[PDB]
Assembly symmetry: C7
Homo-oligomer: 254 residues x 7
């Protein structure tokens, strides 16, 4: 009986002291890292309180008092904190997966479900990238993983797809020859890959040809710009007409 009451008190003391020690330890880590008076004090205090309450529970239980009730309420509380925590816990997990496993790493330009920019840093909970115009976006890793991950710095060659519309009474073959001549002449267009030039759509007020040509990443934006300037000039010289919106109107006096 004496050993029991003494053990209970001894535990109460050991509990209070370790709680103060663990709280002080949490504060050492908070300050060394990145301390915030509210976060360090409140978190350290929550740890200290949980430890002491666990201790009082242990003491009454040793005395013979059934703690089942405090255990169940303590368990429900623990589950609630678990649920709220889960969005952030989820993000952390994704971060780990993302880091060991990963596709995109700092410096690569990517597209993470829309929002595409240059990755500045993949962090614990979120990835930060700098969009093309200069905005800084911070994406939550969990969402990053749920979405597709298209990495642009991984690939070497892509394909441009032009679509020029000419007038209906334009010579199908002439158009084809002129476009074919422009891409054939364009160095930056991989000649060993696709090189499509075809009457593709029977337009509303137009008849348009699709042109598909491959080039290496770097080159591609310019290839499209140059091939297009070229298409505009050659067609103008050759007399091929880029039509305005057409409309047949039938007059009725009244």
């Amino acid at each position: 009986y004496a050993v029991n009451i003494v053990a209970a008190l001894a535990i109460i003391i050991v509990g209070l002291i370790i709680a103060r020690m663990i709280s002080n330890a949490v504060n050492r880590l908070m300050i060394s890292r990145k301390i915030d008076a509210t976060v360090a004090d409140f978190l350290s205090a929550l740890v200290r309180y949980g430890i002491i309450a666990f201790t009082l529970i242990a003491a009454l239980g040793r005395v013979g008092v059934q703690t089942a009730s405090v255990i169940a309420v303590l368990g429900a509380a623990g589950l609630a904190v678990g649920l709220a925590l889960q969005g952030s816990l989820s993000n952390l997990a994704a971060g780990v997966l993302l880091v060991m496993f990963r596709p995109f790493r700092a410096g690569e330009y990517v597209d993470l479900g829309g929002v595409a920019g240059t990755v500045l840093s993949v962090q614990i909970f979120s990835t930060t990238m700098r969009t093309a115009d200069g905005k800084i976006i911070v994406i939550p890793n969990g969402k990053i993983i749920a979405g597709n991950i298209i990495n642009f710095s991984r690939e070497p060659v892509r394909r441009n797809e032009f679509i020029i519309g000419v007038a209906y009474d334009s010579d199908i073959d002439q158009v084809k020859q002129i476009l074919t001549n422009i891409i054939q002449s364009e160095d930056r267009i991989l000649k060993d890959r696709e090189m499509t030039v075809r009457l593709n759509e029977l337009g509303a007020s137009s008849i348009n040809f699709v042109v598909r040509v491959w080039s290496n990443s770097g080159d591609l934006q310019n290839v499209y710009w140059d091939v297009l300037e070229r298409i505009k000039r050659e067609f103008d010289a050759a007399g091929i007409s880029f039509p305005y919106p057409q409309m047949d109107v039938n007059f009725k006096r009244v």
Copy 2:
């Protein structure tokens, strides 16, 4: 049997006395710190009631009545309070993450999933911002974290993208020389970065050029405004036509 009923009564007495002592202690701390009659009295009273209820449960337990049922029901009820609490709990957690971790801090302008304004203050549960027009928005931290966080004050230089459309019969080279002259002259446009001026789209009734030019956050709104006014005037003088909607109409009498 006597030891069990006596122990139960002994526990009830110990529970009531400790409940009163712990309540009085909570009041000592409330007054020494910052006491509020409603907060100190209601909090000390809730602590005292929890302690005694626990004691009664423990006593029926000693008398030897299996409390399993009250424990499960008490447990479910706690889980329910925990579930309801979780949305708000969630917001609190996000706030902590947001504060130690944070991307956007007071004074920065941001877009928190639509709603974009200047951050006035990131608080415990919600962040408050002042939209450009002057509205004051209070966004719940949990929602903020689930969404992307796009911060405009973090990067120093961003890019303007003009898209001027001219009349088809316009001189491609002249249009280019003029736009290039305007951006070249504009001091606020960093000359070492991208300075794109190109025939980009073969329009419906237009033929439009895209101009991409970089400048520092501040300067940027003005740079777009000035470069645009300038483009309107230079083009007018140079005789370049900003076309109206074109339409070729074919007449048919009947």
Copy 3:
């Protein structure tokens, strides 16, 4: 054995009697407060039934019949009631947060995720507001907190944004001087804050100027109405044309 069966019977009796007593007590409290035959009778009866079932469970348990099964079933059912209850519980919690914590209070005009009106009363479970057209909306507090809370009565000054489009051949400078003069003269427009008048967009059939001017809440709807009427008259007099939809049509006989 006899002590076990007698104790079991003794408990069944103590349970039935206390159940009737607790039920009668619930009714005393129901009547003193605000009694409703269905609520007082059904609630008191539910309490009584729970206590008796608990007791029968304890009796079989006292005898030596493992009640684990009834315990788990009772627990799952308890969880289910907790889940159904959680939406409403959630609303109550939000209400508490809303009340001690609150941003918007009676009399303030606000936007609670779309639905924006004047707050009539922040209640226990729901907030009630009266929309500008006269409708009376009752929004569940849980939803209110999940959504953004933009308060218009908090800040005091807001900004109007006009966008007038004139004809392309209008004098840029003249349009700017006339608009500037109008805002300059209008007393209600805070002169120490932003006062933007600029050629902003190179429109379709138009060329439009953006005007951004600040005023105090009240004044603002009127400032816009008045500044606009003013722009309409001043421009007409000065000969600045508000263009109709333009269109170049090219004729073709056939």
Copy 4:
């Protein structure tokens, strides 16, 4: 040993008999209320089966067969049923909240998240209303509570908003006077409340005025119809033109 095997057999018998008794009781309650052969037979049988399985488990428990496994499985299954049950249970809870608590009561016209009609009856699980055109909707109370609740029979006076567009060359003042005269004369328009008549928008092909006028619910649909017919007649007489879609076309022969 004998007492144990006998007690086990004694329990199995007590279990089968009570199970048959509880099943028959469930059927007495099913028939007295509203019996359905499938529901009464299947529900009573499920109760009987649960009781017997619990008993066999108990018997196993008496001989020395740990039933922990069956207990855990039974519990998880119980949890799942709670989850499935929760949507329906949620509806019931909202119903109770709705009935003792409620804003809208039979006879009142309301808008329950879209679906707006005359309330016919707030029941246990669902509210039934009759839409203006005659349809009969039955809305689940859970959904009703989650959504906003706007009651039109509560307040009593709302506001009409007319928006009349006239020709650009119309006299701003004349238009204002005529509209003002019309609303001024209309008795049904509360004269002590808002009475706005203003040049609101600088239209595309029009120039439009906004008119805001309050009236009591009933009167309001008619006030709008009448004030409008009146606006049409007066404007026609006064020479004010309601413009057709405008369009400036510029001809080009070719």
Copy 5:
């Protein structure tokens, strides 16, 4: 020791035999009702396996090996199944609610959140209806209960709403008289209910009147068709013009 090993073996045997018996019973119920070789065999086998595994567990426990581990794992797995199961379980519950409680029963024409047809059968998990064009739709009861439930076979009289647009220079009064005459003459239009004929909208190119008239469900589709044909004819004869799209075009040579 012998009693323990024998009891363990005795349990293993009782477990295998009862498992085969319960499986065979599940098959008897499956065949009597609606048997399906895959469902009856797979379900009966799953029950049999669960019973035997529980038995082996009970046996190792009786021999003297703590099964706690197998119990917790078995428990977690059961929880996972409960979660996957919950969508389907949810549908079943709504089904029960739907059948005893239900608004719509076979033969009634309804709209269950869009998808509107005639109910062919309300089943355990889903309702099946036959759309007006003949398609057969199977809607999950859970979704049915979440959505609004509009029943057309419940009320007997509904309201048609016509909206005829005439030309601006039409006589407001004449249009009203003619429409009024048409509805007045049409027998199938309940004369004791609403009978609205009003200038409702000041159209773009039109000036349209709304006409609301009630009739019995059946009569209603035809009433709308007949009243419309009638409006077209009377108007043509009366000289009232149903206008084509208007457009004032202002010419400019260049």
Copy 6:
């Protein structure tokens, strides 16, 4: 004590041996069925590890070391694998429900939330269909059940709805007679079911009639095609005009 340590060691040995045996058995079943080195080796290994860990746990348990901690961790992990599994488990369940219960079966043409084709096979986890254009889609059963299920093959007779628009000055009666005749003459149109031909809408530039005619599934695509070609020819001959877009333009010189 010796019996306890020996029993513990004997259990460890029995556990390792059975673990290796169960793993080897899983591989026998993997290879006989459809073996994959990674799946068979990893799955067999996971089973083996779970069995041994369970065994070590049981060994310490008999030896008197409270394994509570290892049990809880083991339980959480099981739940996690269970949660991951739940999407697939969910699909499987849906499949079972789908198979005993089902609406659509092989050969039927259906729309399973968008994606609509001919059902090739309702399997365990997924339903496979062949879209009209020839693509082969594999839809997960869970998604299938959550969505509505619209079956086109279930009704034997369906209905076509034609909507032909004629010119405003067309003879209402003549249009009706010609359409009536066309459907009257078309054998494939079930003459005992609905046969609607009516002036349905007072169109923009047209006046359109709706025609509703039933036929048997097969026949229906062709009935619609044939009836339509027929309508075009008869109307052309009869002189009924299928109008182009109308437009009244009012001229204004300036």
Copy 7:
């Protein structure tokens, strides 16, 4: 008592030593396989900590200190981790399913819920494909499995659908014959499968015919391009008119 305290201390020592040993073992395996300082050190340490905590729990267990509290809290936390982990664990499970099971395999062209390309590799957690234009997408297997999986390299023959619109006064039969001739002549069109050429829609300004023709995957893109060029040339020669947008305008001077 001495045996109990000594056993508790003996266990604590056995626990620390085995924990250090198992940790060192985990490191041996990590390094032999594929070691990563953070993964090997963090994983080994986590194992070590779990073992020790289990030990303290068991020792406190011997020393009579009830650990229930630490066990429930440890349990709630484990549940929470289960939840965060589930998204990623979900992806892994789908990966196993995908690899042993898989429909699409490297080299096959597929559509995995939008994003359609040529699979480059199905890996442990993600599938990587190269979209037609050349982009490299990485899709998370979990998402892939949730979505529909349509495989193009599985089936071999698909269908092209042409929709040619001609002028209203075109000869229905001639249009049909020319189209039929073209498809009849085109070898690449499977002649034993559907070959539909029909007047399908009664256009706005057109009358359009639908043409459905099958071919083998490869051939199909080209079949469509070629059949189309052919339709354009044949129709031009035959005099069939591809109409621009029609419009009847009625003039009104004012």
